[PDB]
Each structure stands twice: as C-alpha cells, then as structure tokens.
Design a protein around this ligand. Sequence first.
Ligand code: HEM
Ligand code: HEM
Ligand SMILES: N/C(=N/c1cccc(CO[C@@H]2CCNC2)c1)c1cccs1
Ligand SMILES: N/C(=N/c1cccc(CO[C@@H]2CCNC2)c1)c1cccs1
Ligand SMILES: C[C@H](O)[C@H](O)[C@H]1CNc2nc(N)[nH]c(=O)c2N1
Ligand SMILES: C[C@H](O)[C@H](O)[C@H]1CNc2nc(N)[nH]c(=O)c2N1
Ligand SMILES: [Cl-]
Ligand SMILES: [Cl-]
Lengths: 361, 361
Amino acid sequence: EKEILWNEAKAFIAACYQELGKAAEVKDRLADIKSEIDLTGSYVHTKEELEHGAKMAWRNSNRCIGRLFWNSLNVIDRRDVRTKEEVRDALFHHIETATNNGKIRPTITIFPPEEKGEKQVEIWNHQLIRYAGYESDGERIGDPASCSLTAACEELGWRGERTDFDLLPLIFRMKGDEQPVWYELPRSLVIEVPITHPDIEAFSDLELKWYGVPIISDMKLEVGGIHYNAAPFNGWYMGTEIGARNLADEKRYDKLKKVASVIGIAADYNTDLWKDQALVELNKAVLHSYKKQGVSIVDHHTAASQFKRFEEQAEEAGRKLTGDWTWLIPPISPAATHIFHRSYDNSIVKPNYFYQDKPYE
Amino acid sequence: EKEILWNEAKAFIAACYQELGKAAEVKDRLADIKSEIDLTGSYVHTKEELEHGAKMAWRNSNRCIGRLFWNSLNVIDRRDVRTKEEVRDALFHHIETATNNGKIRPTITIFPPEEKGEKQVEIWNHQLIRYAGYESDGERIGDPASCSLTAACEELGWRGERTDFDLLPLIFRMKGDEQPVWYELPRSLVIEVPITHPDIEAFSDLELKWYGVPIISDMKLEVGGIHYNAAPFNGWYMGTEIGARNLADEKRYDKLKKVASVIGIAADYNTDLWKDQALVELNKAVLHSYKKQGVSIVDHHTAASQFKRFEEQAEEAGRKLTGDWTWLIPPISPAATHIFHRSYDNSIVKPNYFYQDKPYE
Ligand code: HEM
Ligand code: HEM
Ligand SMILES: N/C(=N/c1cccc(CO[C@@H]2CCNC2)c1)c1cccs1
Ligand SMILES: N/C(=N/c1cccc(CO[C@@H]2CCNC2)c1)c1cccs1
Ligand SMILES: C[C@H](O)[C@H](O)[C@H]1CNc2nc(N)[nH]c(=O)c2N1
Ligand SMILES: C[C@H](O)[C@H](O)[C@H]1CNc2nc(N)[nH]c(=O)c2N1
Ligand SMILES: [Cl-]
Ligand SMILES: [Cl-]
C-alpha cells in the first residue's frame, strides 16, 4: 500500500521539480518523503507541489478543450479545515472569488485528502451551483440530471420551491458524521444569466436562464499518490455546454421544440433541419446573453483555436499530448474545428482528475 | 496461404448458409470447396453466396449509418468480364441502374477477384462519379480531394475544362496492361443537382451543384477468403456528406464564407456562430434541392432513426452490433441523435469492405 504511494511520489516529485527548475532539490525531498511515509503512512505536499500538481492534473485532462490556460489556475490550499462551518465558508469563498463579478477566475479549492482511503470531507454536489430536478407522476420539473440528489436532499429536511431553477443547497458530510449537512446558497453569491436573443425579442418568452460558474465538486484530484477526493474546481462555460446539451438534451431541459416555436419555424419535418436551426439560435442566444451581462464565456470555435495553441505549446515543450476525441469535439459543428480532423491518444497521465462513486444513489 | 483461405471459407459458408436456412447443405459444399482449393488454389462462390456475402459485408461496415437496408442490396455478378470494353459497359450500366431516374437503387457490381493477389481489374476512381481538382500557383479549382487522380488522368492524355465541376473519366487498368485506359462519362448517365434554397433566392448565385449518386469504387470486398478488389457499390447520400463536408471543409470546396454572404449574415465574429448558421442553411438547401428534383437523399436525423431500428433489428436477430462511433455521428447536431449518447464496439467482422492502396500517388 505504501509501495504504490512511494512509486507515484517518485514519479511526481521528479517531474514537478523538473518543470519548476528544482531538479537538484529532488533527492533530498524524496529522502524526507520516504521517511515521512515509513513513519506516518503518507506524506504532505508543499504548497508549491500542490499548486503545480493541480495545474498538471488539468493539463492531463484528456476530455478538456480549455487546457491552454492550465498554468493560470488559481489554487486555494484549504487542507487546514476541520469543521463543517470551515468547509461551508471555504465553498462560499470559492464561489465568490471564482465568480469575480463575472470575470471568472479558474479556481480550485483543495480540502484534506483521504487518509487510509477514509475521506475527511465528502461532497455530495456534482457542481456547487446546480438546479434541482423533480419527477412526480407525469409532472417533470427542473433538471432531470439532479433528480437523485434532489430526492436525497429532500430526505434531509430540505424542500425546493419546485421552480424549474431551484438552487440546490451545498451538501457534504464530515468524517465521523453519519449524515451530511446542507446549507442553502446565498443568492447574492450566485450569478445567473437570463437567456435573450440579439435579434429575436420573443426569445425571452421562454424564460430561460443558467448559472454563471460551473464548479465541478465530485471528482477526485490525484497528485503523486495523494487522493484529494474533495477539490472543487471551475473554469468558464463553453457556450455549447449550455445551449447544445443542458438546455437541448431530451433528458435535460428539452427546449428545442419551444425554441423552434419562438423563432418562428415549424418543428414537423426532419428534412427542414429545425433541430439544427434551433440549436444555432439557442447557442447564439447563450453567448450573447453571457457577454451582454459581462459573465465570462467562450464559443466552441474560439475554444478549439485555443486548444490548437495548447497542442502547439505541448509539442514545443516536448510533452506528449493526450486527449479524448469523443469529448473534445463540440456537439455542434464539430467538423468545422480542427479537432474533428485529427486523432488523439487517450492514455491516462497522472496527476489527473478522476470520477468517484456517488455517496447517494 | 490456402490455409487462411480454407479457414475463412469454413467460417463464411457456415454463417451464410445458416442465415439462408441451408445449414444442412454446408458439409457437402465445404467438401467441394476443400477439393476445389486443393486442386485450383482458390474457390468460386455461387451466386447465392456472393449476393449474401455482399449484403453481410455492408451489414458489418462499422462506419455506415445506413445499414438498416442491408438486405435490399442489388447485387450484379460481373465475374464474367475479360475485356476493358466489358468493364466500361459494366460501370456504365451500374451508374444507369443505380441512378434509376433519381429513385436510387443501392447496388454493387462485382468484378473478378484477385487470383494470387493479382488483380484482374484495377479501378483508379475513388467514386465512379467525381469532380476533378486542380492546383496551379495560387489558383485552386474544383475538388482538392481529386488533385492527385486528376493529375494522373492528365498524364494519360485526358484534359479537363477546368470548371469547378469537371466530371472525371472512368479510369481502370486491366491485368497484363502496363497503363490504365480512361473513358469520358456520358453526361446523359450522370444526374446532377443544382443547389437552391427553399426560402433564400440569392442562394443560386453561388452556382453550387453536386452529383446524384455516390458510387465508391476503390474499396475491397472480402467474402470468405476471396478478395473482390474491384466491386463498386452505391447507396444514396446523407445530406450532411454534401452540405457539411464536401462543400464545407476548408480542404474541399470551402463555401461557408460565401454561404454566409448570400444568406445575409456577417462572417467576422466566432461568437455570432456564422459557420454554424451557414452549415444549417447550406444543408437545408442540399436536402431541398435533391427532393425537389426527385433524387433520393436522407437527412441525418431520419438516418439515425433508421440506424436505431438497425440496432433493434440486430439484437432481435441475436447478432452482435459493431460500429465506429467517430464516423456514425453526423458532422452537424450529432448530440441530437441517439448515436452520440451510446457507445459501439469497433470490432472488425467479415465479410466486409476494406481500404486498399491507391495505384496512383
Ligand atoms: C477555463 C475554462 C474551461 C473551459 C472552457 C473548459 C471546457 C471544458 C468542457 C467544455 C468540458 C466538457 C464538459 C462536458 O461536456 O460535460 C471540459 C471537461 C473537463 N474539464 Fe475543462 N474547461 C475549463 C477549465 C477547466 C479547469 C479549470 C479544470 C480543472 C482544473 C478542467 C478540467 C476538466 C475536466 C476534468 C473535464 C472532464 C470532466 C469529465 O470527465 O466529466 N477544466 N472542459
Ligand atoms: C443506402 C444509403 C446509404 C447511406 C445513406 C449511407 C450512409 C453512409 C455514410 C454517411 C457514410 C459515411 C461516409 C463518409 O463520411 O465519407 C457511410 C460509410 C460507409 N458506407 Fe454507407 N450508406 C449507404 C449505403 C451503403 C451501401 C450500399 C454500402 C455498401 C454495400 C455501404 C457501405 C459503407 C462503407 C463501407 C462505408 C465506409 C467507407 C469508409 O470507411 O471510408 N453503405 N455510409
Ligand atoms: N466548463 C466546464 N464544463 C464542465 C467541465 C467538466 C465537467 C462538466 C460536467 O460534468 C459532466 C456532465 C455529465 N457527466 C460529467 C462540465 C467546467 C466546469 C469546471 C471547470 S470547467
Ligand atoms: N452515402 C455514401 N457516402 C459515402 C460512403 C462511404 C464512403 C464515402 C466517401 O469515402 C470516404 C471519403 C474520404 N475517405 C473515404 C461516402 C455512399 C457511397 C456509396 C454507398 S453509400
Ligand atoms: C480524425 C477523425 O477520425 C476523422 O476526422 C474522421 C472523424 N469522423 C468522421 N466521420 C465521417 N462520417 N466521415 C469522416 O470523414 C470522418 N472523419
Ligand atoms: C457515448 C458517448 O461517449 C457520450 O455520449 C459522450 C460523447 N462525447 C461527449 N462529449 C462531451 N463534451 N460531453 C459529453 O457528455 C459527451 N458524451
Ligand atoms: Cl454543466
Ligand atoms: Cl462523397
């Protein structure tokens, strides 16, 4: 067990210190770690290792198109938290600093790691900011992707107003406790963007909106054998995530038919390509709405260009590039991006972010 | 060598006869084949085996979304040809019968197979009907994908008029001959569709058009160890092939900027999603134009629905399904199809159609 930890530690420190220009400080740091592992059963990252490890992990995320700015990640070290009030305020602070009045800072807050595979902090939220979902005999409300977590929260004394956009509470469980606590979100901390169209005034009749900052809070950060199961991170949205998936998928908000209505086209014939046309106008609306409000967002064409630069930067730096083609291509006009026309190695490189099992369900 | 042939033969005949309800006739047919191989070094398919083998090959084509109608394939047995006039007239006939006045019949014409890996007939065309491409100091004309074949044809005494839509000649080489012959296509045999838009009259200013029937003529059909290197096949187009790739790719006709102009939108900002909007209108134009002229075509939504039925038909029949996710998803709105949201096994099953090296280049 402390063998696999030692092995990953050797690989990580060598690479991390190499990139940081600290290649000479390796042996003595690896020395201390080997002792610390022998005596304690684990080791503790320096602030520098942790910060860079979180950046390397983003860089190795095969499914991420926004990796160009991996080195500008804002890393918050909250390994000091011991109380649920401390966790809550850390999460509250993350939302505030990442939002930054709309000029979103890509940020990660890092909580204490697993000890013996035992979690210190266990976050139930998929994202820190997400809408509830309800299904009750034919009546479908909100975000269906949140149906299971919502039912779980309502098992704990929470109650949603049952709008299509109920903000889910923060819900996490501390080590020792049998149940998670939940805290309602302060509305003043959550930026939302109402969806309007630049040309079509009737688009507002849909009363669509989305939240400003996507903060993934259910993935495990792995850095040199250390498992930070609780390390919520954020960037800004690519418009397609909202307009082509969240609001378009039949198993999500399923709004394409209503979009077709308000833009004045029939939704009767496949050969009219009404879904395609609705997707374009909806995605135009999303980008326009975020930019009009001053909330950071990127379109899929610009993002692909940035990713091309990331590919170029990688080869120039002598690093192997890895990627998941199936996730890197945007869900609209993917053949209009260079991504579609080349292949990527889907090998896993650590440090990285990983899926982990949900405590609920 | 006759070991691998015998092995593939055993696997094929057993499966083919099983599907045909002729499972009892297997041993005696396998008997004759084993003798025929021993004495001759190869074996000859019955008409029934060949017809069904060609259908099974289509069914096993992982990259094909149109596989629902695999069993309705029109198979033409031209293993009898010996002369280049016979080949030419066979190819001429294929075009005519497949076109069928616009009501396209999915058809394959099968020529004599390789003997000792030696080709009887060697087709140079990618498709029987395709446009030439020219590149001469900054001057780019026609289809760039045809640049190498065009130069090759012009090395043989052919000369194109250098329009953007020069019909390439049929070009193939007979066994024994050192050079291929080429035959100009009779215009009366080639249906073309001028591209118009249902709502936007200015779209005709682009003077776009495409050919009616895509007839792939450079792939090898493999059936039970027998290599039919020359077996051109056709179906009808999925609109996206023309509107989202052939006319949209920068390395093809690259028409999106001009489409944006004629539909009256700016092509200046990525966030306007002008490429996405142009793709939709161009693809609407393509579908409308084919249907208006009475030439068979399918949109990507309908095609995906048909493919879903193919998936259902396959499981119901107890057959494993194989597919290439990266090719099955349409290049526009793929997330609007069920294909995007499931995975496919990309295993190779024979019989099948395979790539083979180009004689030119
Ligand atoms: C800066 C702006 C960013 C943009 C525009 C961006 C874009 C994207 C997009 C569009 C996806 C696909 C998500 C989906 O389809 O559900 C993605 C996946 C991902 N991104 Fe990023 N990203 C950004 C920043 C970050 C940051 C800061 C991290 C973490 C340090 C990160 C790590 C990931 C990971 C781990 C995934 C895959 C999640 C999964 O497998 O489900 N990205 N990114
Ligand atoms: C009936 C109408 C048909 C439709 C709508 C259809 C649709 C498609 C499409 C859209 C592709 C992708 C082509 C590309 O992206 O370049 C494809 C690939 C393919 N189709 Fe079909 N197809 C049809 C009939 C057939 C037939 C009759 C055959 C042969 C018996 C066939 C075998 C294949 C093969 C082998 C490929 C892959 C070619 C490659 O790997 O480059 N299909 N099909
Ligand atoms: N733009 C983003 N979009 C996403 C990035 C990663 C994941 C997700 C949502 O998670 C997937 C949705 C369904 N399965 C996992 C969204 C980011 C969130 C945090 C940093 S970038
Ligand atoms: N619809 C079609 N489209 C295609 C199907 C298969 C292949 C192609 C074109 O070949 C690819 C284009 C570039 N590489 C190979 C087009 C068909 C042609 C013949 C039967 S169906
Ligand atoms: C690299 C990638 O495999 C390549 O660009 C593929 C992607 N999927 C495709 N799918 C289809 N139908 N046709 C294509 O030409 C391609 N190109
Ligand atoms: C089956 C397939 O892998 C799945 O639907 C994937 C495809 N590519 C994707 N790409 C992104 N960015 N996001 C997704 O949710 C998916 N879904
Ligand atoms: Cl999201
Ligand atoms: Cl084509």
